[PDB]
């Protein structure tokens, strides 16, 4: 479904994967990233800036690292009900697009961390596995592909997954009633 060229944007990173949103912007799961202050893609700290929000991590490079790729829209999650695709790469280079119905956005507790993200329900042993964190969630919005977050967590059994998103909630901020 997703354009063939989009997969070259998914690369190994730390103990997981990350995604080039543009030639300048690389997103990943905080928990898989190399330690802060590590040289990456041949660039030293200072040649890039890093922002984190929950388990979402974004690197911005002043000079393009991948000039061969057009910029894509990065959204803070998407509307509940959107059928998105997790672009999972495995170490072998195998590419597995996993259909997922996006659920609600919330601040989700995973172990000792709190992740701002969006829940999802895998539509199909053939889901995500340890090592997949950082792979992007994308969908075709109208007539263009947009990225909404990165894979961070799943249940062992069952089809629940969590994508970390870049923002903290306003309209989507949960409050006791």
Residue numbers in the entry: 0 to 123, 131 to 183
Sentences from the paper on this structure:
To prevent autolysis of the protease in the high concentrations used for crystallisation trials MNV NS6pro was inactivated by mutation of the active site nucleophile to alanine (C139A). The protein crystallised by hanging drop vapour diffusion in 20% w/v PEG 3350, 0.2 M KSCN, 0.1 M Bis-Tris propane pH 7.5 to yield crystals that belong to space-group C2221 and have two molecules in the asymmetric unit. They diffracted X-rays to 1.6 Å resolution, producing an electron density map of extremely good quality for residues 1–123 and 132–183 in both molecules of the asymmetric unit. The active site triad of H30, D54, and C139 (A139 in our mutated protein) is located in the centre of the peptide-binding cleft formed at the interface of these two domains. Strikingly, in our structure the flexibility of the C-terminal polypeptide has actually allowed it to associate with the peptide-binding sites of a neighbouring molecule in the crystal – a happy accident that has revealed the structure of an MNV NS6pro-peptide complex. For chain A, the interaction is symmetric: it donates its C-terminus to a neighbouring A-chain that is related by crystallographic two-fold symmetry and binds the C-terminus received from this molecule. In contrast, chain B donates its C-terminus to a neighbouring B-chain but binds the C-terminus of a third molecule (also a B-chain). The adventitious insertion of the NS6pro C-terminus into the peptide-binding cleft of neighbouring proteases in our crystals has provided us with a detailed view of a structure that corresponds to the protease-product complex of MNV NS6pro that forms following cleavage of the NS6-NS7 junction in the viral polyprotein. The primary contacts with the protease are made by the carboxylate group of P1-Gln and side-chains of P1-Gln, P2-Phe and P4-Leu. P1 residue recognition by MNV NS6pro is mediated primarily by a specificity triad of residues composed of H157, T134 and Y143.
